[PDB]
């Protein structure tokens with residue numbers, strides 16, 4: 491579908507989609523939110539996949 | 542008054558604010574004591590029902 | 591040794607502050623396979639000493655800004671973890687409360703950091719002209735945006751009504767004089783209308799010659815003033831086709847302004863007090879507010 495979106499025009503101009511430096515603040519996470527992330531399914535699945 | 546209140550306090554024993562970490566208020570033990578009256582100026586006195 | 595590869599890439603990033611491509615690393619260190627270079631880059635990103643740029647030439651790796659330091663008291667990590675979104679906001683600035691929410695830190699934490707950063711000339715705090723609430727913070731080198739602060743009209747967070755009034759008066763007088771001269775010329779209606787027309791660049795040059803105020807007025811500033819005069823119903827603008835000339839502002843188009851008379855005199859409705867009465871809704875035949883005892887007609891007939 492992304493390819494189809496890009497295929498609207500037969501020739502696509504070289505996009506000036508330079509990835510602006512969106513280096514995000516490593517926000518100090520509230521301990522409640524850190525516990526929520528630890529208990530999140532994605533975190534457990536990533537930990538399983540680490541092995 | 543002999544068991545449940547201690548369980549409730551243990552559930553909420555530590556309270557702290559997000560602002561200024563390393564500051565906390567920790568409950569250790571809770572007592573209800575004997576019935577008393579606050580009529581006496583900053584002094585308690587045993588009172589019958 | 592991957593540690594040696596990481597150190598060499600760090601040295602290369604030091605040599606090129608603008609960032610290095612994979613080609614530069616490969617040319618500098620040719621005996622190392624591409625997989626080892628990719629692993630080293632990934633580790634360097636994992637510990638956060640590098641940032642990735644996507645340019646039209648490909649991927650660039652740049653060292654994270656740590657040498658540029660304004661708040662070294664405490665930790666360099668939080669110093670850069672404030673300067674980072676300070677730079678991200680950039681020319682538009684950022685309010686202190688917004689900074690606190692973006693850095694997820696208490697007010698005192700960011701307070702000390704902001705004072706220290708301003709001490710080492712890393713961030714400049716300017717007063718928000720658009721909504722005078724809090725002081726926005728920008729990079730010291732970055733030029734402040736004319737929208738978020740400053741502007742030829744705003745002087746110390748104050749709109750200049752006198753300045754815009756004088757600008758309107760002078761521009762309208764110039765346009766009216768030009769139209770009067772064009773009418774008196776009576777050489778030919780086409781030439782009369784064309785000479786009555788005044789270019790935005792021409793009136794801007796005339797205003798600069800007048801030099802009423804010290805602040806430099808750009809061409810689009812006078813264009814906005816003339817647009818306000820248009821909205822006042824006193825001047826008329828037409829966009830004509832001119833490929834290039836002394837103006838050269840809009841591609842193939844130039845805006846010509848001429849003072850124009852109003853369509854009609856004031857209507858008959860406003861010549862009666864009831865047409866201008868503010869309590870017209872409450873006016874009634876028999877009541878407190880009645881035309882028989884109306885004060886407005888009393889003053890109007892007495893006058």
Ligand code: SF4
Nearest residue numbers: 863864867873881884
């Ligand atoms: S009669 Fe007097 S109050 Fe009523 S609309 Fe006319 S001016 Fe206004």
